Point group: D2
Chain length 503, copies 4
Amino acid sequence: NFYQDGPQLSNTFRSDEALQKILKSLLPADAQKVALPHLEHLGERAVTDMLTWAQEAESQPPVHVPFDPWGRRIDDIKTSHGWKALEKVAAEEGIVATAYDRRFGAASRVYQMALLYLYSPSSAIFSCPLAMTDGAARALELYADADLKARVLPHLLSRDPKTFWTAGQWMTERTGGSDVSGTSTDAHPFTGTSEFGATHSLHGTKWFTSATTSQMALTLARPDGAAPGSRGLSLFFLELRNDKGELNHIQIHRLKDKLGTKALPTAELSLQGTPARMIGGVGEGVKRIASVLNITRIYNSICAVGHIRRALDLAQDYSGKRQAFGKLLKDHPLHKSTLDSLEADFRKCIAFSFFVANLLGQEEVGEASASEKILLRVLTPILKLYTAKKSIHISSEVVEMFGGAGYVEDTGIPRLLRDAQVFSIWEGTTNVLSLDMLRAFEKDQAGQILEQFLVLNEAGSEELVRLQKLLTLSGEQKEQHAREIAFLIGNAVARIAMKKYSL
Amino acid sequence: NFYQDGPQLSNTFRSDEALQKILKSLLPADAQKVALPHLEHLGERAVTDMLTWAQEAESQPPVHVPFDPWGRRIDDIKTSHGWKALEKVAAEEGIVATAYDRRFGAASRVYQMALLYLYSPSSAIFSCPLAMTDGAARALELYADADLKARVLPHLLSRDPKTFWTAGQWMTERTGGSDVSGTSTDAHPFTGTSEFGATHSLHGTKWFTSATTSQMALTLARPDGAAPGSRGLSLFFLELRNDKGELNHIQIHRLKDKLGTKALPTAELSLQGTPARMIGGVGEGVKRIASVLNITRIYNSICAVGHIRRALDLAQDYSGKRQAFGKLLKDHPLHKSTLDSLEADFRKCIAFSFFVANLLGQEEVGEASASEKILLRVLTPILKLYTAKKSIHISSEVVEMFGGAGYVEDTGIPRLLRDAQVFSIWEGTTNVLSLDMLRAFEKDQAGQILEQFLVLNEAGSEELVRLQKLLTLSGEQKEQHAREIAFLIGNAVARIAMKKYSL
Amino acid sequence: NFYQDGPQLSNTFRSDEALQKILKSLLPADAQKVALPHLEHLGERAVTDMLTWAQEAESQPPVHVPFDPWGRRIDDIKTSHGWKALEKVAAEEGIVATAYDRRFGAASRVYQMALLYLYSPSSAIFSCPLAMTDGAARALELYADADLKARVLPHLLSRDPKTFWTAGQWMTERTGGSDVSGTSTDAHPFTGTSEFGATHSLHGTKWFTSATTSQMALTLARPDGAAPGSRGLSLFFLELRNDKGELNHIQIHRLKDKLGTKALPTAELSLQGTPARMIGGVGEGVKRIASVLNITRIYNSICAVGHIRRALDLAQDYSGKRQAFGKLLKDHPLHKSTLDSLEADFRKCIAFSFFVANLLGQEEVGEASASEKILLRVLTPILKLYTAKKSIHISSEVVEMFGGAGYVEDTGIPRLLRDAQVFSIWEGTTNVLSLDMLRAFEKDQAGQILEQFLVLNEAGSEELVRLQKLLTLSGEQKEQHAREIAFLIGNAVARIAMKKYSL
Amino acid sequence: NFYQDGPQLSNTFRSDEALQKILKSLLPADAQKVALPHLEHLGERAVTDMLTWAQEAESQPPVHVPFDPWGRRIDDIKTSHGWKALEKVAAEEGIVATAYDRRFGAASRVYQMALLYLYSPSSAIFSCPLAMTDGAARALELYADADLKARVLPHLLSRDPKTFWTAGQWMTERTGGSDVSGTSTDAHPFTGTSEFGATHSLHGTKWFTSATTSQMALTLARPDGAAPGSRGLSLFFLELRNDKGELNHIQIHRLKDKLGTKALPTAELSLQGTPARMIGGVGEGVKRIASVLNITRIYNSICAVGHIRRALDLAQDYSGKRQAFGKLLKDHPLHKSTLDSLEADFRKCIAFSFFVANLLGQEEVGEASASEKILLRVLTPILKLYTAKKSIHISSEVVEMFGGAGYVEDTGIPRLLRDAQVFSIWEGTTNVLSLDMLRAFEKDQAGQILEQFLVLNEAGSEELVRLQKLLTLSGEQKEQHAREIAFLIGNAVARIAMKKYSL
């Protein structure tokens, strides 16, 4: 008799007025001429072939096969065809490469982040490998010798699926992930054959990694003569496999069985003499990898806001199809008010995100003012923790908006919450990033540069007045209030950005 | 080399100063004589044999076996030994029965709810069957003929596992759960044999049920020739199986694959001429079933707060074992402030819950004033939506407090979020209960009785002023503000209750 | 250190001297011109893309999805991409269609059976659907009205994957498969709409079926008012789905969890008013369906022998790679003698199979003598039970030849035994076919025609003497000796055929 | 409507006339007084609580958990409660210990083998650990120092579940299992703490083992100064865990996913400095472990015949419940003749098995004549390969006797074939044991002692005449015919034993 119609998606570029308004403000005419048709195309893929491949990957999670039938240690990771297909899309659509083709100045990074914004929610979180790939490319561009750059960058930035590499970023060990000072991976001097000029061999265990689907990784290790703690750490480049395709003295222990991001392989592994090449100098590892973090944290933000948009698209569509007590849900004043509130949060998030992406683009093309560089540094952790918390809140409300159906996995709706919860954890928790914000304040007059910016652009906001009072408090009291400070700034900046983009 | 020590629990009665303070206020001396050692005993089981049985049930979810090997339709649901054991615990510890032994007046229900509070978080949500069992006993006690009470109550209230029955409550159909007016299950006059005086046969589909875990159920159906909508619905009692152990014309379609509560069988089923007995008169179904809803909503609340306590117990213990940047997490001011904030929320929730539990007890022993009965009616939906939202927020924060480990299933931590999300959905969503609160106001001056209660018991405040101003608004403006109104009231009653119990 | 190299296959046409000798004897020059390059091509696919697709299908068995997420009964069966691909191969390589292109007279069927012989062992038993498809085409060709032939034959005999249909054959019910007289499926007159001229609606349960893999099926049912037993049964044609792709009143109960053939969906289903079209007259069902049985039994035989060849190819290759006590296994006299014995059995089986395949071809093009038609009738059940038993014996010996590895599933070797066991059970057990042989003798002097054939074609022998003595026995003594009689005949015909083909 | 009744078992002692006749011949009066009531009791357990525990273990196969949630390598093997329960039965019922309590002389081993015969088919192959436990106890009794015997034998032979140990026998490596000469496990001298007087540390990989549920194991290793090949191998004792329960430098790679014996943990593991104690002298390992093989091979035989009896009990019962073509299966002459033939094979197997068990008992109490010791040596491999092949043949026929149902796993019938196939592989393949027979012939005039025995007890058998002609052939021709020779002897001896026991 009666059966409920479930939610349906529509082209994600055409359905997103906020994104279109933002790009009209941030993209110059020559950029729009190329970007808008590309984006409209990607928006179509997001609800057609990508959507199916993502569903396929989520329904067939990766499997570790440590041994072949005759006892050879192979450490294969079996993935779905859909997962492999989503990697190919990332290459051919230039989801990473677009940022590094800086034809459009600062707008190149904006255009790229718009591609990521459409791609990510339909990628089964392949966007995580892409974040680390982008971060790795920038790090190599900034710090690596010309020969290493010549070998690796054409792969990371390739638009050809056959040559495209992704990178892992292997920073977490059992001792800590927030704090890497306890890193126990040793780097012994290495003299031998290599295809990339390896200088050391690495011995240690990496506790969360993206396993072996990536061709390279960056990691931290402690050379034989180095000091303890963070300043005995150097940055290292390594390749996972040799010519023939066998792992370079890398052993996978197991895959993590995770709350969400289930299509994404996350492994514990051991480096057992893995050949590697030091980048930068002894002791410089932590501060050099800091430029990988800035990019991955802005990826995380954009992916979290794309996730919000996907949850709300499903909720909006359902609200026009589900009836209760005589009315469609969208026509119940309380239900509509809840949706409106979530959409308002979304608008803050997407404006804030692209405001920061623009700042990032400005810095990457050398056109950022001293003030803009400081703003980028302060706002990046704030953006990340802000959009992450919002994406979890919104995903949970959307699960509840579907009622009982929201709690049953074959509707696809519980995944929204399971996946969203990752965003406030990966690349730094709310508290770790709140403290990074407080430490950004202590350098280059950054607290005052932020204050001047807020006074210049919206002196009369309710957030600024409260924020000023908090910023006068003691050191440890500011730490205790660090979250409140972060969200006041995030909200103040979101409002400024929304006005700037006419949202 | 280094391995992190994971969280450990300790006796849940001794470790809970809040619960002890509340019980010292609410239980008279004679009740304490019986209750406190029972609770200390149950608090030990909660972290020993129950914890093991719950883990086993969560690791071995129920499985539907529709057919035996020779083609007989049997619709068996295979469960773990741990799940069966937790059912035995519910009987022998009197997790339901304690409330119906009313020697301690209003305190009998308070004592029972303290038992539930300790039991639920170590029950793999067997507490859900218990809520529906308790609700069914109350409905039968209030409305059923003497012969039906004599048959069924000794099973529902038994302390002997061999005799104990649980009940299902089958309201939800595909057309709706919030709104049951679209109920399509027909009740035809029945003149066949039964063991319980069946009067009708039921034909329809019940879309979320507790499957065949229960020996009986209450449900709604539309008798032949009855009016459309909720006004044509009657309340029906049925038993699931006959003498031989065969399902009484009930077919299980499948089990739901759920976000959480995975040990709990939740089934879609069809009634295919299921004999049933009408309770009460034609047209009275929804109003009679409200006494099941009120009890299950208070169970939900107590279970949500027990869940919060469990999440925080794990976080607190971990915070004394995990180090970062040289210090235990508990010694980082921001982490400590976050924990303190979550604990403050916990204290509001438990005080509010037992305040309402005491009111329920008062009404059940006939000692509640007219105003207190009205308070109970108004505060029950508020308590439910209030504690549910807090439980989800706190579980998500606790997941993030464990960092990466928090996101990995074998630590047991992701389950906190997956399970918590259920609390804001079953037995009513936030918005549906917000509206139930608003309809309660429009009956017997309930809004005015509520307001006098808040004014008498708490000083003037901006929140109070804000609430009074909201309560005068338009029909539709009150609806738009229904959530804000509910949380304003919830916060006020929580403060009042915390003061009363010296928390 | 040391790791054993596992078995490898090579092109299955080039590696099979027996098959090549048989085809040089049975195929005329014009047939060889077409067939030999086609077969060499298929022999390559059998060890490349087909082998990969079969492994994938065996590793991802079909899954029944009875309900969509919103409660619609859809009864989907999800299969692997590999399974779908192997269906495409069957069409494009003309694994069925080749027989019905009778330009080469009796040799068209011989050529088709050579294709099946190479295809089947790398098909994850998709060859089972093909047998039933071939059988259905023959039944329709022989018995169906022109309009039904015009509709259906272009699908069954299509070489285009977009147009190709397979058929199921639904005979078995819970009461019996060997004996269909207890068939309980009723056929009521039907006056509704259909796309194929349906005359009845079917109501009953079919206990082993190929589920919804097929677009059509043949089945038996009892029309209203018909006699009891097999004499009341008629043959029915039905299509599984309508225009919209919805099942035509067919419900799938579940898939069988089988010892082997795990990639093949085998379902229990209920016909719940399924429109169907009677073929032939009332009471003629069993006799008309015999032309499906005869073809499927010869398919079974060829598939059993292809299975034997696959098992021995693996054993032979392994025997040239595995060492024990200083020598390759092939150089141990006892191991070599065991292999030689299994190979001698293989040669009997393949010669016997193609001998009967040639007879089938002769009859299908109208060129078979009266005696040869009778030989075909007698030898078909014998061939089937004979090759089946040999396939099981040889598979078990090959499992043991691999030693411990033979018993471990990821080597692929245990599957040889699990799959082989099916061959002696479907389309008739050893005893049921032994009795079919005995009833065939009692019709048209068939026993005497058989005996003259053996005497003319083979010298006198103790086996021959033993057989003649058995063929004169009592009604019940012949039954007790039915197996011995069948294997005596099978061995005699195998020797005669081997001599004829110079094996 | 119609549903088939499935097969049911009855007390396995009372239902087995062949076993009872054998024990009346082999057990003296004082032995029968104790044994027969014990056996009747075990026969009841075999079809009640053991049957359920075995089903439970087969439905919940063991799982390897290499890491705890915090990264500690624990290599846990999770087993079902039923598996644990079947171990307890083995201890309390004295399934091993009974043989070593030699109150009844040679009849003690017979009584024990009768217990094994009833136990094994209902043990989910826990009888395999018991075989290795028995073998280990005998080896220690024969060759170990008094102090080691004092420590270990009370555990192996315990009737108390709390103190009972099982043993593994770790002889197979990747290089070979039939041939152990390629053993690569090194034994370095060890000086340190041990609880059992360890003398060496072991380094190597064992390719098939019974994992970590056993407390001890025997294995072969090559000391630092030893020769290559088999005479550089010494026999070693080791314990798997220390005081606290952690593995003694043993790492489990994975469990095998096997054709059958699915309840039994079979693991690949590495010895990584595992402390061990040499038993016997350097170079003596292979010949000392030969006395473990003799016991495990007779266990295998008895278990294989118990397996035959179980398959036939199910088939016999089904044959009295399934009808086809108007008659119960048992009443169809061809079906009855097939059953009779299988039962005749069973009678040969059980008589042969207990004839050899009696010989074993005679040798263990020092009462075997020179001729009887030689007969035991020659007949042991023959018994093992004979009963194994018969059990596979009979299991396959029984699967087919159940028709389609026989091929579907939830009937329990396919397991009969999957499990039976192990018997011809473990502890030696048919060919390896056939060659061991031929080598037994070359010592102590053994071929002539066997001939004299056959001439004395049944000169007129058809087997002897054929056997004599084969035994005159050349060395390599005897090897080529080794299987035929083995089965002729097996059949000749089975006939002699059947006459001796009045079967």
